[PDB]
Design an enzyme around this catalytic site. Structure first.
Site, short mmCIF file in Angstrom:
data_model
loop_
_atom_site.label_atom_id
_atom_site.label_comp_id
_atom_site.label_asym_id
_atom_site.label_seq_id
_atom_site.Cartn_x
_atom_site.Cartn_y
_atom_site.Cartn_z
N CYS B 118 0.81 -1.22 0.00
CA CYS B 118 0.00 0.00 0.00
C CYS B 118 0.85 1.28 0.00
O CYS B 118 1.73 1.45 0.85
CB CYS B 118 -0.94 0.03 1.20
SG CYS B 118 -1.92 1.55 1.27
N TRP B 290 -8.95 5.66 -0.98
CA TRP B 290 -9.43 6.32 -2.19
C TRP B 290 -8.50 5.93 -3.32
O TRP B 290 -7.46 5.32 -3.11
CB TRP B 290 -9.54 7.83 -2.01
CG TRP B 290 -8.33 8.48 -1.43
CD1 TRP B 290 -7.13 8.68 -2.05
CD2 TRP B 290 -8.21 9.04 -0.11
NE1 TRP B 290 -6.28 9.35 -1.20
CE2 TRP B 290 -6.91 9.58 -0.01
CE3 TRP B 290 -9.09 9.15 0.98
CZ2 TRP B 290 -6.45 10.21 1.15
CZ3 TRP B 290 -8.63 9.79 2.14
CH2 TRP B 290 -7.31 10.31 2.21
N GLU B 295 -4.39 3.54 -11.09
CA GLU B 295 -5.11 2.27 -10.93
C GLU B 295 -6.19 2.19 -12.02
O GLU B 295 -6.36 1.15 -12.68
CB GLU B 295 -5.78 2.16 -9.55
CG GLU B 295 -4.88 2.45 -8.35
CD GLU B 295 -5.54 2.10 -7.02
OE1 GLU B 295 -5.83 0.91 -6.82
OE2 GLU B 295 -5.78 3.01 -6.18
C1 HEM Z 1 -6.27 6.42 1.91
C2 HEM Z 1 -6.00 6.09 0.59
C3 HEM Z 1 -5.29 4.97 0.12
C4 HEM Z 1 -4.61 4.91 -1.07
C5 HEM Z 1 -4.47 6.01 -2.14
C6 HEM Z 1 -4.13 3.57 -1.22
C7 HEM Z 1 -3.59 3.09 -2.40
C8 HEM Z 1 -3.26 1.77 -2.72
C9 HEM Z 1 -2.80 1.30 -4.02
C10 HEM Z 1 -2.37 2.12 -5.24
C11 HEM Z 1 -2.70 -0.05 -3.89
C12 HEM Z 1 -2.43 -1.04 -5.00
C13 HEM Z 1 -3.73 -1.52 -5.67
C14 HEM Z 1 -3.48 -2.50 -6.80
O1 HEM Z 1 -2.48 -2.32 -7.53
O2 HEM Z 1 -4.26 -3.45 -6.96
C15 HEM Z 1 -3.03 -0.40 -2.52
C16 HEM Z 1 -2.96 -1.68 -2.01
C17 HEM Z 1 -3.26 -2.04 -0.71
N1 HEM Z 1 -3.71 -1.15 0.25
FE1 HEM Z 1 -3.93 0.90 0.14
N2 HEM Z 1 -4.47 2.81 -0.15
C18 HEM Z 1 -5.22 3.62 0.67
C19 HEM Z 1 -5.89 3.16 1.81
C20 HEM Z 1 -5.85 1.87 2.30
C21 HEM Z 1 -6.56 1.39 3.46
C22 HEM Z 1 -7.57 2.26 4.23
C23 HEM Z 1 -6.16 0.08 3.68
C24 HEM Z 1 -6.49 -0.86 4.67
C25 HEM Z 1 -7.01 -0.52 5.92
C26 HEM Z 1 -5.22 -0.21 2.62
C27 HEM Z 1 -4.68 -1.49 2.42
C28 HEM Z 1 -3.97 -1.93 1.33
C29 HEM Z 1 -3.64 -3.32 1.08
C30 HEM Z 1 -3.68 -4.49 2.04
C31 HEM Z 1 -3.23 -3.40 -0.17
C32 HEM Z 1 -2.86 -4.72 -0.88
C33 HEM Z 1 -3.90 -5.10 -1.92
C34 HEM Z 1 -3.51 -6.31 -2.72
O3 HEM Z 1 -2.45 -6.89 -2.44
O4 HEM Z 1 -4.25 -6.68 -3.65
N3 HEM Z 1 -5.05 0.87 1.79
N4 HEM Z 1 -3.40 0.72 -1.81
N1 LIG Z 2 -6.64 2.41 -3.50
C1 LIG Z 2 -6.93 1.12 -3.27
N2 LIG Z 2 -6.92 0.67 -2.00
O1 LIG Z 2 -7.07 1.54 -0.99
N3 LIG Z 2 -7.19 0.29 -4.28
C2 LIG Z 2 -7.51 -1.12 -4.10
C3 LIG Z 2 -7.42 -1.88 -5.43
C4 LIG Z 2 -8.29 -1.27 -6.49
C5 LIG Z 2 -7.91 -1.70 -7.91
N4 LIG Z 2 -6.47 -1.54 -8.10
C6 LIG Z 2 -8.69 -0.88 -8.93
O2 LIG Z 2 -8.12 0.09 -9.46
O3 LIG Z 2 -9.87 -1.21 -9.19
#
Ligand code: HEM
Ligand SMILES: N=C(NO)NCCC[C@H](N)C(=O)O
Ligand code: HEM
Ligand SMILES: C[C@H](O)[C@H](O)[C@H]1CNc2nc(N)nc(N)c2N1
Ligand SMILES: C[C@H](O)[C@H](O)[C@H]1CNc2nc(N)nc(N)c2N1
Ligand SMILES: N=C(NO)NCCC[C@H](N)C(=O)O
Ligand SMILES: [Zn+2]
Lengths: 420, 420
Positions: B118, B290, B295
């Site tokens: 993340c 958000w 993405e």
């Molecule tokens: C506040 C804004 C946030 C942003 C902009 C953000 C952004 C991102 C992005 C760009 C990814 C990669 C998505 C992908 O490539 O599929 C990601 C993955 C992840 N985020 Fe965040 N995130 C945010 C909030 C959160 C929150 C609130 C949680 C959990 C409480 C979180 C948990 C994770 C986890 C566990 C992953 C791994 C997903 C996977 O492996 O498929 N994120 N996030």
């Molecule tokens: N920003 C987050 N997590 O907080 N994205 C979660 C995965 C969404 C996925 N990568 C999509 O664009 O549909």
């Protein structure tokens, strides 16, 4: 048994068998991934005081010979056994042993073939090898290096080549090129606080100065070859300008781009790596392929630690340079990339865009998995510095492992050297 | 003692201490790097038949409580000891134990804090937690999920939130969301050979059909929530359209872009991950933050396995679509990226460009190293799918390791389920 590997774009699945032949230990620990590290110890082959212990050398030598002889379509069994015999005999009589020219050639290509950070590996069988194992002086090294630059450049029609200098004997008689690459620009920390030229070659530029080099104080001053032969102190040799082919940068639409006074050398030649083959190590074996547009356009020109020309290419483009969300940086870098591609193309200097290169690497991976059940690959290096997922390699899972022969990094010579 | 980590852009050096608290085994082997693997076992927490053995649960529980209580500025020692006592007592009397709401909150934030993939982690302390541990039926899950979507959406002013359902007891009574994410589009393999909608949700769309879902055969059909409660078979619930906020795509200069009839949901909510905290596991805890422009613009719209709109955005731009070296792909993707950013901005829906996001993550890393001596990071996921080296994170070396609490992946439910 084997590791399942999937390409998330095509859905295709491959099974890696090759990782079994990997070296003792790689870059990662059991509870942590260190793949992000630029210079891990697992990718570095340092200095020595004594020759390679016979017990370590022999098995490695035999293993290389079996690999070599197990290559040919129709095995030359008698010769295979004969070579195994002569090599063992040579080792127990001299301590070390000498590779045949055909073995060296095979060795350099396999090493390249085993470079997990190289994306140009589909070209692995097209490599010119310059045998300079009989070299003894710095002046002779310099001469060999000049023949290399001249040959590789081929007046823009770049040819992949490598020059092999004498192998490490006892370790206190190493031939080493102190430069990062054969052709590289100088970086000076000017009186007005700024920095001119290549900020990455700062420390090395000073070293050249301290060794009596004449600082031309510019942005594109080709640095001198700093050569050390048979362990003696490094001798400074300036590269003949007639040999250093450059490409002046110009955009095919933005006529103001050439007003930037930008250019880059046409020859990417790694100078400080070590070749390891069958227990043998060559701490001086400069090699080159041709450029991939992004190396120049994105890294050399846009890295903050390099030329850092992003802000002003953005300004001259009229973009909202003070608003990150405008994605001006994405716009600039792309235009700089086309400038580089366009410029090399116009001046007939070989180059390849990152897209066609990626596609060819993918083809290489396929050829390699079918041919030998694997392909050591470092995703972090193979994926271009821009347009990541737009590229096929981004979606391809890969295994990174150290095989043999291999091109290792080595400790910067000025940190571990005798000064007589 | 610790691992040295360097940022090659700023030159800054950090020493990672945190990796010592890592879990038993990570994704990499001793002689190979598996960091490139999307779904490694080290990142997956599968099914179960029996409850967590007491001997494993207790130490983990105690360790979590010490972490929790060791958090507060001025330690509540009496309460700390009192909680340690009550938890042990509860474990030896019930088999499992219940977290206090304040502990859950702390747990969800730490887990997010420990998400190496993340990039939004600077926001770790701003997370709304919905306690649905008392839920028992699919209809109740559905209701909780609706309150989540509604709250998180906040009419475009997105708020990070997570909904925690009942923890895994014996393993045969798991609450699970069969969807990848809360809101996702359907993908159908049409009669004319093509594919409509989201090609990634193909297999799952079929599953929804087989469960009596009405296929609306479009490009942007919001899929139904497929909920399984207390181990019972999954019940299909359609999401109320009034809840699914979408952004219609339009370029701020190319008026023909809206003619593409493109849109995307404003709520990225991961639905299939498991929360692990102090020996406890919650196999159903949908969460959301958000969107980061790339993405949608790069992955959702340009992946070959997704919407694959690159070729036609290129065509409509007038670019040389049949000449890879023209870098048309780089030009298109960037324009699609600004369309996404522009569209969300125009419609007042929260979003962040990949540059500002990277910078903030860098700031987070700095805060994290200073505060706790480390930050588990997966370079391969943290570096945006475009403009790699133009971003700060690309030049930052990082250590990837699994801490606790943590968000794990789990095996797709339809592969391991009872059908009564
Ligand atoms: C506040 C804004 C946030 C942003 C902009 C953000 C952004 C991102 C992005 C760009 C990814 C990669 C998505 C992908 O490539 O599929 C990601 C993955 C992840 N985020 Fe965040 N995130 C945010 C909030 C959160 C929150 C609130 C949680 C959990 C409480 C979180 C948990 C994770 C986890 C566990 C992953 C791994 C997903 C996977 O492996 O498929 N994120 N996030
Ligand atoms: N920003 C987050 N997590 O907080 N994205 C979660 C995965 C969404 C996925 N990568 C999509 O664009 O549909
Ligand atoms: C034929 C054209 C070739 C192309 C386009 C190509 C391209 C590349 C690129 C893009 C890199 C990364 C450079 C960087 O980011 O610093 C690289 C690295 C590398 N290549 Fe190739 N290559 C080619 C030929 C060769 C040859 C002929 C050899 C060796 C015989 C080779 C050996 C390697 C090695 C060892 C690295 C690692 C460098 C390092 O770690 O710093 N390549 N190559
Ligand atoms: C920190 C990070 O490992 C480093 O900046 C990397 C990333 N990938 C990469 N890739 C290539 N081809 N060359 C490089 N110099 C780097 N450097
Ligand atoms: C094969 C490779 O691991 C895979 O395509 C990766 C790369 N990095 C990455 N990064 C992010 N943020 N999301 C992803 N889906 C992926 N997938
Ligand atoms: N293409 C190669 N090798 O074959 N490049 C070697 C490194 C050159 C370096 N990246 C530069 O752009 O200056
Ligand atoms: Zn690794």
């Amino acid at each position: 048994q084997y590791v399942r590997i999937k390409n998330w774009g095509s859905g295709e699945i491959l099974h890696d068998t090759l990782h079994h032949k990997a070296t003792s230990d790689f870059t990662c620990k059991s509870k942590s991934c260190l793949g992000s590290i630029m210079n891990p110890k697992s990718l570095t082959r340092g200095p020595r005081d004594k020759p390679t212990p016979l017990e370590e050398l022999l098995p490695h030598a035999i293993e290389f010979i079996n690999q070599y002889y197990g290559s040919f379509k129709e095995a030359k069994i008698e010769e295979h056994l004969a070579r195994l015999e002569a090599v063992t005999k040579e080792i127990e009589t001299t301590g070390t042993y000498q590779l045949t020219l055909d073995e060296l050639i095979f060795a350099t290509k396999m090493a390249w073939r085993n470079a997990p950070r190289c994306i140009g590996r589909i070209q692995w069988s097209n490599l010119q090898v310059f045998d300079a194992r009989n070299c003894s002086t710095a002046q002779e090294m310099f001469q060999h290096i000049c023949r290399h630059i001249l040959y590789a450049t081929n007046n823009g029609n770049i040819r992949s080549a490598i020059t092999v200098f004498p192998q490490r004997s006892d370790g206190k008689h190493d031939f080493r090129l102190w430069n990062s690459q054969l052709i590289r620009y100088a970086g000076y920390q000017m009186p007005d606080g700024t920095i001119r030229g290549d900020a990455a070659t700062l420390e090395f530029t000073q070293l050249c100065i301290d060794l009596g080099w004449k600082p031309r104080y510019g942005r594109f001053d080709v640095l001198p070859l700093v050569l050390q032969a048979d362990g003696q102190d490094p001798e400074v040799f300036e590269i003949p300008p007639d040999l250093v082919l450059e490409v002046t940068m110009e955009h095919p639409k933005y006529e103001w781009f050439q007003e930037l006074g930008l250019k880059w050398y046409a020859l990417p030649a790694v100078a400080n790596m070590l070749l390891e083959v069958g227990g043998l190590e060559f701490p001086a074996c400069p090699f080159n392929g041709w450029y991939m547009g992004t190396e120049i356009g994105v890294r050399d020109f846009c890295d903050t630690q390099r030329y850092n020309i992003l802000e002003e290419v953005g300004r001259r483009m009229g973009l909202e340079t003070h608003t990150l969300a405008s994605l001006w940086k994405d716009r600039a870098v792309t235009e700089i990339n086309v400038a580089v591609l366009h410029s090399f193309q116009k001046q007939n200097v070989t180059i390849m865009d990152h897209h066609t290169a990626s596609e060819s690497f993918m083809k290489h991976m396929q050829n390699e998995y079918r041919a030998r059940g694997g392909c050591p690959a470092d995703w972090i290096w193979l994926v271009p510095p821009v347009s990541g997922s737009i590229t096929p390699v981004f979606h391809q899972e890969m295994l990174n492992y150290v095989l043999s022969p291999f091109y290792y990094y080595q400790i910067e010579p000025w940190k571990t050297h005798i000064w007589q």
